[PDB]
Design a protein around this ligand. Structure first.
Ligand SMILES: [Cl-]
Ligand SMILES: [Mg+2]
Lengths: 243, 240, 195, 111, 235, 241, 244, 231, 250
């Protein structure tokens, strides 16, 4: 054997074991989710409070690309940052040449091709993150999830990390119970609940909730963080549902 | 470009590629350097498994770097050409910028520096060659004899030998060479060099080369008959 | 730099080169030797742009001396002249060309014949019985057309050369402070001290 | 054709005493026959008790001062907060100016 | 095989740790710093009696105010010295002053870790850099192939280092004279050297503010050896 | 055995990495099919959306390379999209350099030459995909050309790819034995799509809803994919016959 | 990374040998024998073709003997493809020398440079060496007629008579026995063929399994001629010496 | 085991062993403490010596007038990273006339360390850093790890036996955070914190190293007789 | 990133073998049989068209390729490797010869250039040898008709007639019996079809056999008239119909 020692090597199955090993690092990371809504998207993430010494609200994990795209990820945090830095370069060159801000499907392929490129050579390592991202463009709202292999699809709801199965189950219920659609303000509240429910799979350390959102009506198509009264309102909604 | 670090440290603190290059030197034909009061003599072994050779055109073992400095060697023959060429170029380059031919110490220091560079450069192996560099500095009558080796260390020697069975001939020179009184004449210096090679060589026919270097660019190679006379004289005195 | 002459006779090549080095309205030196020995039987005189001349001469000298050490053999005058021409032929299409004109006087030991080559800065080589660079030629060529014979001795060649220097000293506008004369023959290169 | 240089006028003046030194300069900035500013300083405290002015073309002058101030900063980092002597500063400035020998800083500098 | 810039499980660079083993095989070098100067001394260690010992150059001048002693694969030191000399002279050209001993050492140590897959391996030589400047006075630095350097009051490197360092621990005090330090280097060298110490197989040097960096003659060192033997027999 | 890790020869003259890239082709567990009409070329592929949270409109293995050329992929989506983006760039560059639209067979050759390079050069791995290119070429007419990880390519009367490829292949072989011709003798592309689906149903033995299939159609001067409702309309026509 | 798959072609063994050079020489020892013999008035080059097929076109073929310029030729032993790379380099080097100095290249200078190229492949670059040994036969006005050999190590030496390729041990003993210094070309022709005839692995030595060439001063007055022998000319010389 | 040859290789459980081995070099390093209030931010570092004849390895490095760090692990790697920070702080000043935010300083270090963990040939940085600073949003303290992970904290500690000081700061959190407008008292709390990581050895005059930055205080380092006040 | 494979992947083993070349030859052995026969007034090259599927159009896959108007090539071994070699061979005929001399290269020199490319894949960094043996037939004014074989090592040999691939051993024996120096072109085509029937197993007709000749000039295939010196290509690919005509009188 030895097929798993080097990146870009096919095993006799037809598999790249190094990419599958990168997925294990993603599964080890904290939970993160994405919810598509009527006229936009909502992102949320679990931040484990390792110590009392962590400054609350001052270790931000959700990142913005351009002014209209939000990115969140689970796994190796530095690898996620590297991917977003590339995304920002890709989005900048698109806007430079074509004037219009980068469409979300166009942006999704730019990350996809870059991540896929890191499965082509043994001189590079695959990305140790699954990235949930999306936003609002001319054609409306889009939510995407990108994996270490370079594989991505569009999603109604997306989840990754240690509590992905709990979050996926909860997401599937929302899709069934709301066929006509879910509103932006509702999706923020649901996002909080799902993170709190998904925290049951990581319940040794208590956590800090962080939510962001893009919406054509609520945020005017731009990416913003949920803070203050709207954040506390979503936390209280989540606290009421667990009990 | 080929980048691989071939020369690297081992757990015990040794650079094996440099040490294995020394083994190639140990395999090479013997070379000896003896410096007298007013001269230096470079002696060289030539293995006698090769008959039907053409000695006119076959590369000589002792090479002129400039008109006043010579270089003999032990180890890989092909490797030695590269060092000799580089040294010859540096010799002319020194004349061009300093308006003065190289000192023997400077030329040695350059050659040694090249050998060292190949022990910590990527994509290259060390030179499988040790050299004996001998001559006289410009406007100077003090004889100079230096040694270099694959690692890049160099030093000055009253007399020295390198190559196969060099430890035997070094043993001979260590008792037969007096520091207080070196070989006073050319004949005495050549004889001691031939004597030292006769401990190792086999026959004193077309197996020994001798080159004598004197001050002010006075270098000459001895012929077969001239060398054979020393061999004949030494053997008759030995039977005693 | 200015005056360099060459005369090939029966058994030798004679090169005469002016001693003056002028800059502006000042003769900075009056004992300058405008030549380099390339090999024991090959001499090159030079004249042209300041700095370029010596830099080029010494560069060629180094290369020929390197060849001599490598092969333990002296290159023929024909071979040296061809090497020099090629270097100038490269130079002329460079970013900054060597503006140097040269005469190469040599004695071929294999042929037992003297040889004189005239090469300009463009890389224009010609073998000649007598040669000159710069404005000198406008006087010396016609003079030598008349007085030169192919079977002359070295002493006859020196008298023929004295005739050229006298004419140049008479009709040239600039003071070139006399010449250094050198002879190239079977025994090598030597300088005439009293000219 | 584009001319990269300009003349911003003004004048500067340095005098040295026994235990002190002054570096003065007017505060006027001009282009051609117009006044740009009545108060635009061009004599700067660069740290380590060194004052500097680069008068002539203000863009080049500001660039040079900026670079020297930055040179003083890195002198501290690289040499254990050692004080840059006035003679050492002068030599450092020579290398700054001569580095652009073939596209000069159009300024007369005094420290 | 394995990468050149690889970490061990204990958190150390394999190649750097292996180069340290090469330095232990090297000849002994000792340095002692005082308020009157810094002394540097080395074991020459000739491999054969035919080798002319005066050609063994293991103590070296960097500038007039900075000296250097070496131990290990001494061939590797040539490019380090070349860099140090250029750094010292270049700084004088840019700033019209002598360069700080620490700043020089730091510049040399920046070469150390410039290896990988830059040069192919770490240096196999340790350096004792001794010098003087106006700010921090007389200084002695130990520069390793790890890129680290420590200042020392006294330091020994090479094969007899751990034995000599323990001896320097007891003998060093802050009021040592230069003459006392010279004898102390000779004393400790004689203890750790294989062959018997004399003027031909050992070399002394020093750096003082007044006279700068000076390598001692074989005649001068011989008298200090004779002075040392008499003083030990005197009690 | 490092001769199985990179693209160098084994003792028996084989490239194991190429052979393992072929096995990666079936990792998606999807079957594709391509047939030619008189005026058109139809390609169909299975569409499997297992996760309920997926946006089914974004799940696709058919690609529009140029206006005239379409491409279906059998293999993992990252490698599929890698090949698609390259083909799109190559087709665009061809038009710019040579002043006419890149033919289907020429693009297939170009992609095949790229795939060949990965089998010879060590630092590049093969893509674990089989690319089926379809168009109505202005010179050659209806065209199907298929590329694999070995760098092999060839034209086809019809073809199929996937896990149950052999069953589909023989199903089509038996039809062309019977019809005695190189194509589907049919006027409209609508009925050629109906043929393609019908024969896939017979070969695989499964029934299809509108969301279980994905259809691409090439006509003169354009290639286009069908929507769910376009396929549903097509499935109704088959059922009522 | 890629370190895993690196053969490390340019390293020393513990004994101080170059693995790849030694193995390249092992390759050459299975190649068809090539002999060079230097006489006072010329040089002979003889070489045995590797197991010939009856349908091989013999007259328009070149496997062993190649022309570098008008005065110098080489006999090959090893990989033909490798040899042709080096030959084209040598041909160019000779023309560079002629262009520079207006003189034909001295034999040793050409040999040294080609040998220096081979040396480079053993010390740096991480590539395999050239699996080729040459016999150089040439003439210049300094040393006259000269025979050299070079091998994958980049080491070259001069010879009066020499063999490369297969059965060199046996071939060198036979040459050492019958060679003498006052020998003529026609005698050397006979020696070259007799040696191959005894050392050959074939049943009998025939015209179709041989390449032959001479470098004489047999042209008109003080000039050298290269003669690459035709099939019919080899047939005649083989009958004339009484081998067939 | 088989997956620790280089940084480009993942283990079967999704681990990067070369990054973990680099993390191990920090644990071997000497202890250093970081803590802040709302007005000031303090670094306290226990320096280490080779022996009694040697000097004590300098742990604290200045990056700008308003920012600097302390190190634990490979000192040459800290020099490379601190030099990068000096350049980035300086770029921000020259181009934008803007003091570099302490948060951006961290982001830049994270991205620099990350590139070394994804490419063949290179290696991870073998050092951990505690960055303090005072910018437009008040006092800050960061913890850098060579995996790439950067974390903003009220207080922390890294190096050998750093768990003792980290526990103390976790208890003292409510006290030291409100030491506003009082440098000496915030240092005292830091000196008492690092004392919880001491074994056999105690804090001497040439052993202790303190640094401070704040509202009306540039980043300055205290060594030698200047720290005798706090023993 | 970047090609870090700057070292040779083909090296000498202790026995003196070059493993990757031997293994490439093994890949050629597995390949389908192809052959070439030289006549007095022409040359014939032929091979079986092994179809991957009956749905595949074997006309689109051309095993016999034109390199120049007077030179053609056929192979045995790995098809993709052959295809890129033909591309490179066509280009090198222009860049290294026609753009210099204003005329197409002679057979031997084009062969030499192809061999050079295949040799470099045997020694250069980060590459394997080509897994094919080529048979190159051609004509030029001063050498006349000629036939060459080119192996993965880069070695090439001229042949009167030969075969390579699957059943080459038996096919070469067959050709030895039938070949003489007085063969006319039509006789060589006849022998080629006889020799190839032995190695082919399934169908044997003009649709499963690919065959081309280097013969007389073809003015009708030139595409233009008006230049007397330009008389047309000597390379001609025989049609499916033209093969079947000769199979009746077999
Ligand atoms: Cl292509
Ligand atoms: Mg002229």
């Amino acid at each position: 054997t030895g097929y798993d020692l080097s990146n870009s090597v096919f095993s006799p199955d037809g598999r790249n074991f190094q990419v599958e090993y990168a997925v294990k690092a993603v599964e080890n990371g904290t939970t993160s989710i994405g919810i598509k809504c009527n006229d936009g998207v909502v992102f949320a993430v679990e931040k484990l409070i390792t110590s009392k010494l962590l400054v609350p609200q001052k270790n931000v994990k959700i990142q913005v690309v351009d002014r209209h795209i939000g990115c969140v990820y689970s796994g190796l945090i530095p690898d996620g940052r590297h991917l977003v830095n590339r995304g920002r370069e890709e989005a900048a060159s698109f806007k430079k040449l074509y004037k219009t801000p980068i469409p979300i499907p166009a942006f999704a392929d730019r990350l996809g091709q870059y991540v896929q490129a890191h499965t082509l050579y043994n001189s590079v390592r695959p990305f140790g993150v699954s990235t949930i991202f999306g936003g609002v463009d001319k054609n409306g709202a889009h939510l995407y999830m990108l994996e270490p292999s370079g594989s991505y699809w569009g999603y109604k709801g997306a989840a990754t990390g240690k509590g992905r199965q709990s979050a996926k189950a909860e997401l599937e219920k929302l899709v069934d119970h709301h066929p006509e659609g879910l509103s932006a303000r509702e999706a923020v509240k649901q996002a909080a609940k799902i993170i709190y429910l998904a925290h049951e799979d990581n319940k040794e350390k208590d956590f800090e909730l962080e939510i962001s959102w893009c919406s054509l009506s609520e945020t005017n198509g731009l990416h913003k963080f949920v803070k203050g009264d709207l954040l506390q309102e979503a936390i209280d909604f989540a606290q009421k549902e667990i009990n | 470009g080929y980048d691989r670090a071939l020369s690297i440290f081992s757990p015990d603190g040794h650079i094996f590629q440099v040490e294995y290059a020394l083994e190639a030197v140990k395999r090479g034909t013997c070379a000896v350097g003896v410096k007298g009061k007013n001269c230096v003599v470079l002696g060289c072994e030539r293995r006698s498994t090769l008959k039907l050779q053409d000695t006119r055109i076959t590369p000589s073992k002792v090479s002129k770097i400039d008109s006043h400095v010579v270089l003999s060697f032990s180890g890989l023959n092909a490797d030695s050409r590269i060092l000799i060429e580089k040294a010859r170029v540096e010799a002319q380059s020194h004349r061009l910028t300093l308006e003065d031919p190289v000192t023997v110490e400077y030329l040695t220091r350059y050659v040694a520096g090249v050998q060292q560079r190949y022990t910590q450069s990527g994509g290259v192996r060390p030179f499988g060659v040790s050299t004996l560099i001998a001559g006289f500095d410009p406007r100077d009558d003090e004889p100079k004899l230096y040694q270099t080796e694959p690692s890049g260390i160099y030093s000055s020697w009253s007399a020295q030998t390198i190559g196969r069975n060099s430890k035997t001939v070094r043993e001979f020179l260590e008792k037969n060479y007096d520091r207080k009184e070196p070989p006073a004449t050319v004949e005495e210096c050549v004889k001691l060099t031939v004597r030292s090679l006769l401990e190792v060589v086999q026959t004193g026919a077309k197996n020994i080369e001798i080159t004598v270097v004197k001050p002010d660019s006075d270098i000459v190679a001895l012929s077969s008959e001239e060398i054979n006379q020393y061999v004949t004289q030494i053997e008759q005195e030995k039977q005693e | 730099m200015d005056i360099i002459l060459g005369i090939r006779v029966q058994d030798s090549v004679i090169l005469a080169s002016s001693k003056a080095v002028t800059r502006g309205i000042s003769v900075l030196k009056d004992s300058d030797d405008k030549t380099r020995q390339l090999s024991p039987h090959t001499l090159m005189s030079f004249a042209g742009e300041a700095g370029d001349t010596v830099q080029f001469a010494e560069y060629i000298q180094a290369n020929i001396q390197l060849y001599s050490i490598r092969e333990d053999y002296e290159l023929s005058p024909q071979a040296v002249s061809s090497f020099v021409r090629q270097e100038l032929a490269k130079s002329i299409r460079s970013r900054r060309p060597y503006q140097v004109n040269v005469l190469i006087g040599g004695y071929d030991k294999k042929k037992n014949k003297p040889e004189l080559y005239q090469i300009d800065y463009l890389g224009t080589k010609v073998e000649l019985p007598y040669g000159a660079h710069g404005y000198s030629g406008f006087y010396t060529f016609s003079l030598l057309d008349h007085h030169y014979r192919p079977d002359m001795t070295t002493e006859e060649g020196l008298d023929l050369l004295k005739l050229c220097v006298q004419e140049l000293e008479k009709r040239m506008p600039m003071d070139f402070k006399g010449v250094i004369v050198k002879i190239v023959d079977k025994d090598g290169i030597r300088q005439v001290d009293d000219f | 054709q584009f001319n990269p240089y300009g003349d911003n006028g003004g004048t500067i003046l340095g005098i040295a005493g026994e235990d002190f030194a002054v570096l003065a300069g007017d505060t006027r900035n001009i282009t051609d026959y117009s006044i740009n500013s009545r108060y635009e300083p061009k004599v700067f405290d660069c740290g380590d008790n060194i004052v500097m002015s680069a008068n002539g073309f203000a863009a080049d002058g500001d660039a040079l001062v900026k670079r020297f101030k930055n040179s003083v900063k890195w002198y501290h980092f690289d040499h254990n907060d050692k004080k840059l002597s006035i003679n050492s500063a002068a030599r450092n400035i020579q290398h700054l100016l001569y580095g652009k020998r073939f596209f000069p800083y159009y300024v007369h500098t005094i420290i | 095989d394995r990468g050149v810039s690889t970490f061990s499980p204990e958190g150390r660079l394999f190649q750097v740790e292996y180069s340290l083993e090469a330095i232990k095989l090297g000849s002994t070098a000792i340095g002692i710093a005082t308020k009157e100067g810094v002394v540097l001394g080395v074991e020459k260690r000739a491999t054969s009696p035919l080798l002319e010992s005066d050609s063994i150059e293991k103590i070296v001048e960097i500038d007039r105010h900075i000296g250097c002693a070496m131990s290990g694969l001494t061939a590797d030191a040539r490019s380090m010295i070349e860099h140090a000399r250029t750094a010292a002279v270049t700084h004088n050209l840019y700033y019209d002053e002598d360069i700080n001993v620490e700043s020089l050492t730091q510049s040399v140590c920046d070469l150390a870790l410039r290896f990988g897959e830059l040069m192919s391996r770490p240096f196999g030589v340790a350096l004792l850099i001794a010098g003087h400047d106006a700010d921090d006075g007389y200084q002695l630095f130990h520069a390793e192939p790890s890129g680290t350097f420590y200042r020392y009051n006294a330091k020994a490197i090479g094969s007899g280092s751990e034995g000599a360092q323990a001896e320097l621990l007891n003998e060093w005090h802050s009021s040592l004279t230069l003459k006392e330090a010279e004898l102390l280097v000779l004393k400790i060298l004689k203890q750790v050297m294989e062959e018997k110490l004399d003027e031909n197989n050992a070399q002394l040097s020093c750096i003082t503010k007044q006279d700068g960096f000076k390598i001692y003659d074989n005649e001068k060192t011989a008298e200090l050896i004779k002075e040392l033997k008499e003083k030990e027999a005197a009690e | 055995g490092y001769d199985r890790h990179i693209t160098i020869f084994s003792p028996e003259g084989r490239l194991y990495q190429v052979e393992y890239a072929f096995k990666a082709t079936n990792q998606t567990n999807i079957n594709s099919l391509a047939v030619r009409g008189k005026d058109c070329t139809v390609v169909i592929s299975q569409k499997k959306v297992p996760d309920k949270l997926l946006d089914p409109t974004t799940v696709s293995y058919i690609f529009c390379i140029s206006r005239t050329i379409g491409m279906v992929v059998n293999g993992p989506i990252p490698d599929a999209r890698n090949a698609a983006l390259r083909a799109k760039a190559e087709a665009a560059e061809f038009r710019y350099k040579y002043g006419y639209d890149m033919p289907c067979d020429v693009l297939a050759k170009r992609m095949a030459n790229l795939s060949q390079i990965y089998t010879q050069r060590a630092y590049m791995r093969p893509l674990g995909v089989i690319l089926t290119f379809v168009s109505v070429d202005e010179e050659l007419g209806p065209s199907i050309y298929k590329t694999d990880p070995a760098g092999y390519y060839v034209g086809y009367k019809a073809t199929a790819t996937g896990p149950k490829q052999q069953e589909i292949t023989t199903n089509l072989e038996n039809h062309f034995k019977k019809s005695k011709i190189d194509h589907i003798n049919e006027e409209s592309w609508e009925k050629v799509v109906e043929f393609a689906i019908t024969h896939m149903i017979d070969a695989l033995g499964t029934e299809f809803s509108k969301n279980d299939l994905e259809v691409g159609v090439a006509t003169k001067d354009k290639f286009f994919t069908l929507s769910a409702e376009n396929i549903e309309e097509r499935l109704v026509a088959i059922a009522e016959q | 990374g890629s370190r895993r798959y690196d053969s490390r072609t340019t390293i020393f063994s513990p004994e101080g040998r170059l693995y790849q050079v030694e193995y390249a020489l092992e390759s050459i020892s299975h190649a068809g024998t090539a002999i060079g013999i230097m006489a006072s008035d010329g040089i002979v080059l003889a070489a045995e073709r590797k197991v010939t097929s009856t349908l091989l076109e013999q007259d328009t073929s070149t496997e062993k003997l190649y022309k570098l310029n008008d005065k110098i030729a080489v006999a090959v032993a090893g990989l033909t493809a490798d040899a042709e790379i080096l030959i084209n380099t040598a041909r160019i080097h000779a023309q560079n020398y002629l262009k520079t100095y207006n003189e034909d290249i001295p034999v040793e200078i050409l040999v040294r440079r080609l040998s220096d190229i081979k040396q480079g492949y053993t010390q740096h670059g991480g590539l395999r060496p050239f699996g080729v040994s040459f016999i150089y036969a040439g003439y210049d006005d300094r040393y006259g007629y000269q025979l050299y050999t070079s091998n994958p190590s980049g080491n070259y030496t001069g010879w009066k008579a020499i063999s490369v390729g297969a059965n060199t041990s046996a071939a060198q003993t036979l040459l050492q026995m019958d060679y003498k210094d006052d020998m003529k070309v026609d005698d050397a022709i006979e020696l070259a063929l007799k040696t191959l005839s005894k050392t050959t692995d074939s049943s009998a030595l025939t015209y179709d399994r041989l390449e032959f060439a001479t470098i004489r001063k047999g042209a008109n007055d003080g000039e050298v001629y290269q003669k690459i022998f035709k099939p019919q000319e080899i047939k005649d010389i083989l009958v004339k010496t009484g081998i067939t | 085991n088989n997956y620790d040859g280089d940084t480009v290789t993942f283990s079967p459980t999704g681990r990067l062993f070369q990054v973990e081995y680099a993390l191990e070099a920090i644990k071997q390093g000497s202890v250093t403490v970081g803590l802040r209030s709302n007005t000031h931010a303090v670094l306290v570092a226990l320096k280490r010596n080779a022996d009694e004849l040697s000097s004590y390895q300098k742990k604290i490095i200045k990056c700008d007038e308003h920012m600097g760090l302390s190190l634990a692990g490979l000192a040459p790697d800290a020099r490379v990273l601190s030099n990068y920070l000096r350049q980035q702080c300086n770029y921000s000043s020259l181009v934008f006339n803007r003091k570099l935010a302490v948060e951006r300083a961290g982001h830049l270090l994270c991205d620099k360390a990350q590139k070394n963990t994804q490419s063949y040939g290179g290696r991870p940085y073998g050092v951990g850093l505690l960055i303090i600073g005072y910018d437009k949003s008040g006092a800050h303290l960061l913890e850098f790890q060579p995996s790439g992970n950067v974390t903003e904290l009220y207080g922390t500690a890294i190096g050998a036996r750093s768990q003792g000081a980290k526990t103390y700061l976790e208890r003292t959190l409510d006290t030291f955070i409100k030491i506003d407008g009082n440098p000496d008292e915030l240092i005292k709390a830091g000196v008492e914190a690092i004392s919880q990581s001491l074994r056999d050895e105690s804090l001497t005059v040439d052993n202790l190293s303190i640094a401070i930055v704040g509202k009306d205080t540039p980043f300055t380092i205290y060594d030698g007789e200047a720290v005798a006040k706090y023993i | 990133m970047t090609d870090r494979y700057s070292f040779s992947l083909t090296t000498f083993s202790p026995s003196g073998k070059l493993g990757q070349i031997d293994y490439a030859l093994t890949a050629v052995k597995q390949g389908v049989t192809s052959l070439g026969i030289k006549a007095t007034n022409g040359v014939v090259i032929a091979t079986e068209k092994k179809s991957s599927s009956p749905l595949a159009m074997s006309e689109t896959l051309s095993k016999v390729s034109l390199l120049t108007p007077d030179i053609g090539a056929v192979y045995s071994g790995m098809g993709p490797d052959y295809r890129v070699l033909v591309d490179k061979s066509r280009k090198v005929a222009h860049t290294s010869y026609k753009r210099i001399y204003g005329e197409y290269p002679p057979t031997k020199l084009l062969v030499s250039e192809v061999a050079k490319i295949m040799q470099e894949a045997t020694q250069s960094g980060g590459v394997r040898p080509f897994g094919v043996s080529l048979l190159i037939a051609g004509h030029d004014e001063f050498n006349g008709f000629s036939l060459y074989q080119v192996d993965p090592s880069g070695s090439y040999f001229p042949w009167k007639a030969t075969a390579i691939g699957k059943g080459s051993v038996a096919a070469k024996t067959f050709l030895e019996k039938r070949w003489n120096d007085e063969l006319e072109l039509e006789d060589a085509i006849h022998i080629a079809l006889l020799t190839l029937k032995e190695s082919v197993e399934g169908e044997f007709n003009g649709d499963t056999i690919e065959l081309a000749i280097i013969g007389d000039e073809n003015p009708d295939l030139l595409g233009y008239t008006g230049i007397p010196t330009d008389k047309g290509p000597r390379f001609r690919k025989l049609t499916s119909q033209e093969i079947n005509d000769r199979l009746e009188a077999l």
